[PDB]
Amino acid sequence: ETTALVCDNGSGLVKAGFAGDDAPRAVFPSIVGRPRHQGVMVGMGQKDSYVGDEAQSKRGILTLKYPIEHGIITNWDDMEKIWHHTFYNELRVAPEEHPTLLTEAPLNPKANREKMTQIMFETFNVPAMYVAIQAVLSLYASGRTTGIVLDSGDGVTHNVPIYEGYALPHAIMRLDLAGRDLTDYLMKILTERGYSFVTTAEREIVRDIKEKLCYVALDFENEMATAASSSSLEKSYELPDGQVITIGNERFRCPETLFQPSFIGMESAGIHETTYNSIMKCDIDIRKDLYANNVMSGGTTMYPGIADRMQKEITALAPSTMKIKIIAPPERKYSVWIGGSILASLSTFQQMWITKQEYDEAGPSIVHRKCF
Amino acid sequence: ETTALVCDNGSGLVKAGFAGDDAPRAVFPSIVGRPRHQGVMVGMGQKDSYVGDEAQSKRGILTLKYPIEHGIITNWDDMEKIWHHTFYNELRVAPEEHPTLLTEAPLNPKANREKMTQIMFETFNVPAMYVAIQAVLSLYASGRTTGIVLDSGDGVTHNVPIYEGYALPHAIMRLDLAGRDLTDYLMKILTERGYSFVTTAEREIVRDIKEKLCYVALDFENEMATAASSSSLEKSYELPDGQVITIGNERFRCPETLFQPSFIGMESAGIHETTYNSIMKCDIDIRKDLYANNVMSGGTTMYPGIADRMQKEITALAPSTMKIKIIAPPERKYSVWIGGSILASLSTFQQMWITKQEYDEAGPSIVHRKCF
Amino acid sequence: ETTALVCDNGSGLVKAGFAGDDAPRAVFPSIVGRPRHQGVMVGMGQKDSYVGDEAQSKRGILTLKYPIEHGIITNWDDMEKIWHHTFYNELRVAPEEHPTLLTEAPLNPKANREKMTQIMFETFNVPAMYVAIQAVLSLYASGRTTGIVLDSGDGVTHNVPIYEGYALPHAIMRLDLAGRDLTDYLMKILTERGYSFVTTAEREIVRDIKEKLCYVALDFENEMATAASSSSLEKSYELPDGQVITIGNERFRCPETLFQPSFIGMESAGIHETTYNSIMKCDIDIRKDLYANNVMSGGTTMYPGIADRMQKEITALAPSTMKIKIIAPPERKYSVWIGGSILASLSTFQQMWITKQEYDEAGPSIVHRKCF
Amino acid sequence: ETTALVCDNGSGLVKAGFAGDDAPRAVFPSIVGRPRHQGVMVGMGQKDSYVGDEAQSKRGILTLKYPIEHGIITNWDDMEKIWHHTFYNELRVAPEEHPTLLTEAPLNPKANREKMTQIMFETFNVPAMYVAIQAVLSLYASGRTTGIVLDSGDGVTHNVPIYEGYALPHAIMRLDLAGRDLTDYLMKILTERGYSFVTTAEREIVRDIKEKLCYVALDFENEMATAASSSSLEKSYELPDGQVITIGNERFRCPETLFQPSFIGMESAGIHETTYNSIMKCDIDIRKDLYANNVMSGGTTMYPGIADRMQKEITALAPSTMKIKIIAPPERKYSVWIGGSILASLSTFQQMWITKQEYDEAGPSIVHRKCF
Ligand SMILES: Nc1ncnc2c1ncn2[C@@H]1O[C@H](COP(=O)(O)OP(=O)(O)O)[C@@H](O)[C@H]1O
Ligand SMILES: Nc1ncnc2c1ncn2[C@@H]1O[C@H](COP(=O)(O)OP(=O)(O)O)[C@@H](O)[C@H]1O
Ligand SMILES: Nc1ncnc2c1ncn2[C@@H]1O[C@H](COP(=O)(O)OP(=O)(O)O)[C@@H](O)[C@H]1O
Ligand SMILES: Nc1ncnc2c1ncn2[C@@H]1O[C@H](COP(=O)(O)OP(=O)(O)O)[C@@H](O)[C@H]1O
Ligand SMILES: *CC(=O)Nc1ccc2ccc3cccc4ccc1c2c34
Ligand SMILES: *CC(=O)Nc1ccc2ccc3cccc4ccc1c2c34
Ligand SMILES: *CC(=O)Nc1ccc2ccc3cccc4ccc1c2c34
Ligand SMILES: *CC(=O)Nc1ccc2ccc3cccc4ccc1c2c34
Ligand SMILES: [Mg+2]
Ligand SMILES: [Mg+2]
Ligand SMILES: [Mg+2]
Ligand SMILES: [Mg+2]
């Protein structure tokens, strides 16, 4: 025993590695694909189902299933296959000589924590494990002890206010609008230009359109007047069949849904009011140190111009006598993992593991009373 | 002129009727809903906004706003719509030939009473009006002149000690934890079983889960051991789509928040210590007659086992040489209206109305020197 | 006309009745209470002010005023209300067909006797009246014509020597230390145990602590050593809220102030030296008959052990060749009333009344040339 | 040995330092706060409980307790923590090489002095100590030997008359209305403007509103007519969350409760009649020197206009032939400490200490026969 495993099994992308590093080694999407066609040439390298990157590169013949829906592991058979591909097939590591540090989103079902610990204690047989919380590791990568997090991953966004290491769990605002729901809205409004993107392998292409051509408008109704003079707004993208598409106001009208969720028919508020309603629900004393520390994390905070849109809109809600400081690090896509690798590298942490001999005599219901 | 109107505009339910009756005629929720969708079939009975019961049955397409937050009327445009729906559209009564008796919670802002009187004196043009206090009408329905009230409505709970018709305003203990804050905590902990109830049309469903399946545990830490042997505790409820939910220890863990407000993260005491601190702040003579008369009122005192839990916990605080007598009538959900209907039916009361010719020469500031 | 009224309006208690009986009918405290709180339920048995026992059982919401301070009637509006409650509301008697026999303490202001007679001759319109002296009716209840009285009521204590029915007015020793000044000292030293008794309804409780648990130590500095071995001295009393209080050397240190008035900061001598200096201001031949007749009266002589303490301390002052005989009846709390009912029942007395036709032609200044 | 410690452990603020100085060094509130939230990041500077200023600055996550209620130490575990924070963590001094001079209010329980001496003689092990009286050091800072003090701290107010170094302890008038009871009334009447200040960390904000915007009205009913023309009376205050609040006639209605305690429902009189009743209970030959020397002390006498209101209201009680002279020094907030630092600097005082070898052979009951 020298080091520990840090697995940030997100809903859209698995980020794993070793503790003590700075960048994760195994970064691959959490996709399981079964082939949906006949396969006349039986043999010669054909498997029952593909996982990770090899299900991404063979995706014309596959139907691609994500096992994690909204931070919630729905298909426990495919999730066990992703962890099997994570340990053996990309870290080349034995599970039995490394403690693991899983994460999860807050406000998940309790059955999600119980089954992750049970799989790690007879399917892989880790020595000890620990299920952290994704948003408090985002501060702890940032070198802070106080701030509100906007951890906008692929399945869920969730605010967590921390003041000096103390979580305020009544002010956690979990929302169910993230990079899956922006992708599935971007497919819906690429139809009006003509492009029918229907399959589950075509949502892997619209996800790549979104990661290249989408930005956040600083003023939305002003940019909707710029598309009337449709000149410099349009850019192009070459599909995997060599076709080019043209995309106009759909570049910014897709990440506007983070700030006006009524485009996809949600009765909730944007991420500017969900952050502001997670500060008003805190105590009146700590609102200086929460307005001055807004930490973004996860991949959906990587649109160009989103740290300038939140600061333009929280300022319109917070009173004008104090500064709003959106803090977006450049590596904020991997920031949950980096804080996990820092956490498992501490010396004040090794009493906080959940060892197997402490597990089995106390049952898998132990993991809830060890977190929050 | 024969009779008077009695309107208990609560924060969660409007209860109105005529003076001298025994049960209110119009009992409808104080909800204003605007439609959040498009409405392609323009015409054929479509209005801009729905109030009351018709905003409850059509709530799938509406965003529902309660205009009374914590006993404080915030949206004066929509509170005017509920009174308009109260008089014309459910009592079928003209306002101009009936003096009305509004109520309110104690320790409200003074701007709340000034606007309720101003709206009644040019929007509806009532002859006279009177704004009572909700907790002293709860004794006066009970046929008492002495007692401490626990009027636990939908927005605010407040102790009001009355000794022999003399109010002790330095001992009124207003608290901000009631049936909204129990609903919003029950939505938070149904999530740990899996059920994401997010919209404002879904807090109308969790409010009905609370009114059917939640009880108060007599011993909370004993009932948490019963949920370990999870046998006779779980009951099922059928959603309006047809799904079933299996609520477990969330049945009693929701009304525990009345007795331990730190679950929703409040720095205030439970309703057993708020009652006992509202008696210690009284004079040492009258504590015989306040321990012997604990009157519950309002809707949030209707959980099965709350009159047995308050008596079990005030006894742990009060000295053991005297009896604690929680007095809970079966009609205590309507007990504020009944005492108001008795009060407007008295003969020693018709000089206490605030007539319009007395209003307009003195102004809207007259209403404060006519109460307490 | 058959019988006469006898009203011993003390400073702390009104004792009234008819002449010729042996016990007074109306024994109620001379308290007038106005309600200090608000009064939300206007009616149903609410009055501007309460007197006597109904101001005692409702005293949690009242500010209680004694209108007789140190034997001197200071509030003539409230004293008129105690007499009105005395005649109509507790004797059920008309004033106009009964001559009344008021009393008073000696050495009072002359304006006190004038106003008592002026009120009785137009407010109540009694036929005739007579203002006696309280201490000379204490011998006359005891069946003596020679003695020295220690009439220790609630406002004033005063020695009155009488030899053979001849009062010696130059040896009357009025002192201003009585049951109010012991109550207000007992409140001051119940604070050192922790108990804060502040209001004028809490002095109605400390007065009842004094009437149950206070005694007179035979040797004071010997009993202060018993409080060092704090074993059998302490007793417990139960408040009306149910809190038991512990009380040790405050039991006897409260009636020590009668014997050492420097505890409440008086430049006067105790009741043993006031009695002895009231005897050595008399003639040398009658001192054998005043030492052998020490009649006690008033309520503050009812502490257990005060006849044993006065006899132990006058003997330390009187010469050893002559005996001291403290005479304390069991009904000496009522002894001023009993002697007044004997006096009004005599046949050698009916020319001593002050009739109204003798009043009005001679003025209000007649009552002074009829007593002493 | 060169110098001595002077600790004025008040109810709302600890004022300590060394003898012989002119201003105290360690001024910090006597607050012990425990964290009430979860604490995810265990380590990195987290403690079980915070004291003093660090419990004030981190107060959003704390529940703040004052250990001294009404001059009475009600939590001996936390009071021991404030003395420990005083000696080591803000004076940086050893207890064992400095005699200390504690103070207390008059008329405290006897158990309060015994436990303060017991803690100083085994927990900190001082050489010698001395418990003074807070009001008699307020004269002795002022350079007087004759005067009456109105020492109005944070827990209690109390008058102490002194004529030429002789305390008149039967005229000491302790009251239980001070800067806590004015803060808790100011929270009650800030609610009628709309502001709910509920938590014990929000009473630390209302205490800072009181120290800025409150003044004593010279004529109360005249200023209540000024609030009808609500023009020059309102001022604004910026909360820690940057919300400005507007405050009108609550600026003077809060310190009016010092002069009319029936606003918070007390059966006591204001500080002008308590001072006047403390002078009339003294001897008639010294009332000229007490009317001419009214010394104020403690922080609650620092409202603008309180020396002009006492002089306006004692003059309406005292007879017109003798002058009233309210003497308020500008450093009267620290005046109890300054007179204590003078007292421990005298040469006629070193026989008045209570040394440990005098303590242990005589017991903890020695401290009471060494004062007054
Ligand atoms: N450069 C980018 N710009 C915009 N969105 C991105 C970018 N990169 C990734 N995303 C979105 O963020 C998601 C990945 O975020 P991540 O933090 O991995 O979420 P999770 O960890 O929950 O899987 C992807 O599904 C994608 O939709
Ligand atoms: N039978 C019940 N059991 C439990 N809770 C109830 C019941 N009836 C109503 N409630 C709760 O109490 C609230 C109604 O209280 P109510 O008396 O209407 O308050 P108000 O009239 O002051 O608004 C509802 O919001 C609901 O959450
Ligand atoms: N049994 C008792 N023991 C001790 N003190 C008593 C007792 N009864 C009455 N007192 C005190 O004496 C007072 C009553 O004396 P009382 O004869 O009524 O005087 P007066 O009639 O002149 O007012 C009461 O105020 C009470 O303090
Ligand atoms: N400048 C000020 N104006 C008005 N009130 C003040 C001011 N400063 C302090 N106070 C009040 O006085 C109290 C402090 O008085 P202090 O002398 O510290 O009392 P103690 O020392 O007995 O605790 C505080 O609680 C505060 O409410
Ligand atoms: C369940 C949980 O929230 N664990 C958790 C998350 C994050 C975090 C960051 C930094 C820490 C430092 C020291 C100790 C711990 C312990 C748990 C923990 C953390 C830390
Ligand atoms: C402002 C207010 O509290 N009014 C009020 C409340 C309740 C109540 C009950 C019974 C009453 C009987 C007679 C008169 C009044 C007057 C006001 C009033 C009441 C009553
Ligand atoms: C003023 C006065 O002291 N009158 C008084 C008191 C007591 C007393 C007792 C017995 C008496 C017998 C006969 C006559 C009188 C007259 C006055 C009188 C008394 C008597
Ligand atoms: C218990 C007590 O009141 N001690 C006390 C207070 C104040 C004071 C002032 C000045 C003094 C001068 C000389 C001696 C003493 C002794 C005690 C004392 C004082 C003084
Ligand atoms: Mg993630
Ligand atoms: Mg109600
Ligand atoms: Mg008497
Ligand atoms: Mg002080």
Residue numbers in the entry:
A (entry chain A), B (entry chain B), C (entry chain D), D (entry chain C): 4 to 375
Tell me what the authors wrote about this structure, in their words.
Actin, one of the most abundant proteins in all eukaryotic cells, can polymerize into long filaments, one of the three major types of filaments that make up the cytoskeleton. For almost forty years, N-(1-pyrene) iodoacetamide has been used to covalently label actin at C374, the only solvent-accessible of five cysteine residues. Here we provide high-resolution cryo-electron microscopy structures of pyrene-labeled ADP-Pi- and ADP-actin filaments, which not only explain these mechanisms but also show how the presence of pyrene modifies the filament structure in small ways and why other dyes coupled to C374 compromise polymerization. The pyrene group conjugated to C374 is largely sandwiched in a fixed conformation between two adjacent actin subunits along the long-pitch helix between the barbed end groove of the subunit near the pointed end (called the P subunit hereafter) and D-loop of the subunit near the barbed end (called the B subunit hereafter).
Image processing of electron micrographs of 411,301 particles of Mg-ADP-Pi-pyrenyl-actin filaments produced an electron potential map with an overall resolution of 3.0 Å and 240,254 particles of Mg-ADP-pyrenyl-actin filaments gave a map with an overall resolution of 3.2 Å. The helical parameters (rise and twist) of pyrenyl-actin filaments are nearly identical to native actin filaments in both the ADP-Pi and ADP states. The maps of both ADP-Pi- and ADP-pyrenyl-actin filaments show a clear, continuous extra density for the conjugated pyrene group. The structures are very similar; RMSDs between the alpha-carbons of the models for Mg-ADP-Pi- and Mg-ADP-pyrenyl-actin filaments were only 0.35 Å, smaller than the RMSDs of native actin filaments with the two nucleotides. The map densities for the connection between the side chain of C374 and pyrene, F375, and the backbone of G48 were weaker in Mg-ADP-pyrenyl-actin filaments than Mg-ADP-Pi-pyrenyl-actin filaments. Furthermore, the B-factors, a rough measure of the isotropic displacements of atoms, of K373, C374, and F375 were ~7.3% higher for subunits in ADP-pyrenyl-actin filament than in ADP-Pi-pyrenyl-actin filament, while the B-factors of the D-loop residues similar. These small differences indicate that the longitudinal interface between the B and P subunits may be less well ordered in Mg-ADP-pyrenyl-actin filaments than Mg-ADP-Pi-pyrenyl-actin filaments and might contribute to the difference in pyrene fluorescence. Lower map densities for the link between C374 and pyrene and around G48 and higher B-factors are evidence of greater mobility in Mg-ADP-pyrenyl-actin filaments.
